[PDB]
Design a protein around this ligand. Sequence first.
Ligand code: ZN
Length: 127
Amino acid sequence: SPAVKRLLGWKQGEQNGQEEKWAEKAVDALVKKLKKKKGAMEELEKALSSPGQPSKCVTIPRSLDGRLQVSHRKGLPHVIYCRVWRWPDLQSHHELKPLDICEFPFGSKQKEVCINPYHYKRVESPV
DNA sequence: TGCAGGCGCGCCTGCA
DNA sequence: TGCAGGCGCGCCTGCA
Ligand SMILES: [Zn+2]
């Protein structure tokens, strides 16, 4: 997919042949989800292209669990995309704190969850 | 063209 | 309660 190629140019880090193919499938699962909503893909690309410039929420439906499954692998969606485009070494959701600018941060128990990586800041995980 | 096979969501179990 | 992983219906789409 050509959209997956433009977003994968923003991917951080150096992953192996298996993990590069997994992030490609994770980005594809997200593109397939944001294509139904008008302006969602454009907002994500803008947020990724201009890091230090304000961006709107880019959300997907919240599962009861909080997990998103991509190629039989389970994980929280906002952690997945924050790892792809910002912090490859992100250990867990405990290392993310939402910005006041985000309406749908993870943990807000709303119908939608924001996956815009620049709507979270990286923090040290507590004891 | 269409439906079969692939695989995610949502249920569960098991520690902790 | 949180979190990891098994399982199978049901939605989807790729290739027969
Ligand atoms: Zn947001």
